[PDB]
């Protein structure tokens, strides 16, 4: 069951990683920010916008600098 919504790459298996980065941030945000994003699926309690954007700003700018490789994923099942 290592499939996904085909229709992204011709050879490269990025479609599989595209999902990793998603769940990767979901844990990074909920970790300290303890809040999900507007694009994030139903899970954590939606926090106010004032704090959501105020926390998301540094959250991403932080994980993007530090969590550069940590947010790496491997190709799908072959």
Curated annotation (Swiss-Prot):
Localization: Cell membrane; Postsynaptic cell membrane; Cell projection, Dendrite
Entry-listed glycosylation sites: 78
Name assigned to this protein: Acid-sensing ion channel 1
Record remark on domains: The second transmembrane domain (TM2) is a discontinuous alpha-helix disrupted by the GAS motif, which forms the selectivity filter by adopting an extended, belt-like conformation aligned approximately parallel to the membrane plane. This peptide belt encircles the waist of the channel and divides TM2 into two discontinuous helical segments. The distal helical segment of TM2 interacts with the cytoplasmic portion of the first transmembrane domain (TM1) from a neighboring subunit, contributing to the structural and functional integrity of the channel.
Organism: Gallus gallus
The organism's place on the tree of life at top rank: Eukaryota
Residues the UniProt record annotates as site (Involved in proton-dependent gating): 67
Subunit relationships: Homotrimer. Heterotrimer; with other ASIC proteins producing channel with different properties.
Family, similarity comment: Belongs to the amiloride-sensitive sodium channel (TC 1.A.6) family. ASIC1 subfamily.
Its biological purpose: Forms voltage-independent, pH-gated trimeric sodium channels that act as postsynaptic excitatory receptors in the nervous system, playing a crucial role in regulating synaptic plasticity, learning, and memory. Upon extracellular pH drop this channel elicits transient, fast activating, and completely desensitizing inward currents. Displays high selectivity for sodium ions but can also permit the permeation of other cations. Regulates more or less directly intracellular calcium concentration and CaMKII phosphorylation, and thereby the density of dendritic spines.
Positions of disulphide bridges: 2-77, 20-73, 24-71, 33-55, 35-47
């Amino acid at each position: 069951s290592c499939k996904a919504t085909t229709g992204d790459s011709e050879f490269y298996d990025t479609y599989s990683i595209t999902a990793c980065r998603i769940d990767c941030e979901t844990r990074y945000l909920v970790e300290n920010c303890n809040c999900r994003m507007v694009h994030m699926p139903g899970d954590a309690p939606y926090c106010t916008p004032e704090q959501y954007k105020e926390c998301a700003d540094p959250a991403l700018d932080f994980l993007v600098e530090k969590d550069n490789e940590y947010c790496v994923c491997e190709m799908p099942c072959n």
